[PDB]
């Protein structure tokens with residue numbers, strides 16, 4: 358019952374597309390609960406909405422895709438050369454696929470599971486790991502969450518009601534488990550710290566808080582953004598830049614002195630799933646023993662995910678023509694073992710993180726539910742009536758393909774950088790249906806980080822650029838690819854422009870901003886011409902000059918009569934044998950355990966009196 362602030366009575370929850378992490382803050386680990394709900398096929402209208410898409414794929418692809426994969430193969434040839442080895446390659450034996458029926462002795466292939474005890478009873482819904490053994494000739498699988506936000510676009514819900522009912526039944530499931538054994542009636546004994554994305558939907562967060570308090574009936578809820586948690590999870594003191602690669606999205610933000618820098622936040626619309634898709638496509642393309650591979654099927658997906666989870670690498674020293682194998686488990690058959698060979702497919706796949714247009718090509722365009730999305734309108738200011746979610750400059754820029762990393766000359770980069778505060782201004786109160794609603798962000802990871810970094814400095818405290826370039830956390834379940842930190846460093850260094858490489862840029866940019874201020878400022882009398890309307894351009898052309906004057910000055914200043922100071926690229930993975938997927942929960946559970954949380958719990962009464970308004974007063978970030 359009673360509402361003290363004590364870590365015993367707290368539950369930490371970090372939702373996401375793949376799985377919901379959940380447990381008490383003192384737990385060495387959280388329970389990781391798959392983000393699924395399996396629904397009997399007969400309980401749903403399945404005609405008009407249609408797309409019985411759980412049964413179809415494509416080995417042959419477009420020209421544009423073959424081009425890109427060709428380009429990807431050359432990139433691979435080159436790296437390989439630049440260190441190691443090449444061969445006769447693709448020439449094969451899987452063209453003659455030989456299958457070996459196993460007895461019911463399936464020893465473990467990886468992680469925590471072994472042979473599959475399936476579920477045929479289609480008279481109830483099933484949750485989590487249980488939904489995963491739900492044979493999909495009787496069940497459909499829907500997923501309440503899309504990475505910390507609510508999965509609005511799914512076709513298998515018809516209203517927020519449905520969506521929330523199984524959000525609450527998924528959590529209850531989670532909360533009822535061997536290791537944390539919590540029934541709904543005892544829920545009101547517990548506070549929750551909830552992790553939320555860096556660019557959250559205010560309507561979603563608010564809804565979620567409203568449910569945790571008012572339906573599930575928890576004591577009090579505190580919220581934190583992913584990036585900040587991932588810092589408490591590790592070391593929070595510095596200014597750091599978090600890259601977070603999960604299944605659906607990859608998320609990048611910089612954090613400095615306790616706040617997530619808004620204009621650094623990027624959400625790339627690709628992640629581990631896309632790799633899993635690309636990789637299976639790639640094997641199919643190298644004549645893989647299973648040729649009709651129903652991938653958007655629950656059963657085939659689970660295979661594509663297992664292989665890639667086993668086999669993808671960025672480790673050039675381990676790339677060889679080699680002998681792998683897998684067991685294709687049986688909805689209604691005998692377990693069948695196959696044996697296949699592999700060469701480059703293990704790297705081409707993850708390399709698509711740098712050629713993400715390929716990912717767009719191999720998946721269908723979003724098909725969101727307007728009858729659902731209607732019910733969850735985007736939060737607006739109760740006064741002005743304007744979209745009032747956090748709105749990132751970097752996200753806007755990257756989505757639109759306006760990356761400094763794609764700019765050649767030092768002037769245009771500097772002119773845009775000198776322009777930012779205007780573009781962020783035009784952003785916050787534009788005729789702003791502008792800056793695409795529907796568009797997905799497919800910027801390549803390396804160029805994205807650079808943006809995130811560049812904008813986080815110039816829009817806050819420029820001097821921290823060094824700190825940022827030498828604390829890039831790579832976190833998140835999909836980041837467990839080996840040698841990711843290696844290839845990534847290689848690439849930023851290829852791609853980060855020289856102007857944004859000079860360790861003395863900030864000090865320079867800090868000078869240029871001053872001498873530009875000394876033109877609007879220490880000339881507060883109408884410019885030298887007696888009569889003017891355009892004469893702000895004679896000081897706009899003097900701006901343009903002082904730009905080039907210092908821009909040049911700094912380049913002559915750059916020979917330095919010798920050695921050069923230049924930002925590092927320190928990408929830091931967690932140690933081998935720690936789970937990057939779980940840093941975030943860990944961080945949230947660190948918060949849950951200190952003096953701070955106390956000031957940050959929105960209690961029930963809090964909520965009833967004020968509504969979403971308290972987030973203005975009780976919140977670790979400026980709501």
Ligand SMILES: Nc1ncnc2c1ncn2[C@@H]1O[C@H](COP(=O)(O)OP(=O)(O)O)[C@@H](O)[C@H]1O
Pocket residue numbers: 372373374375376504602603604605606628629630662665666667669833834835836837838938
């Ligand atoms: N060993 C591995 N190699 C590559 N990717 C992996 C490995 N293990 C897990 N993954 C992927 O990590 C991701 C973890 O997702 P999660 O961390 O929840 O992201 P989100 O925040 O969108 O849920 C999944 O896409 C999973 O496929």
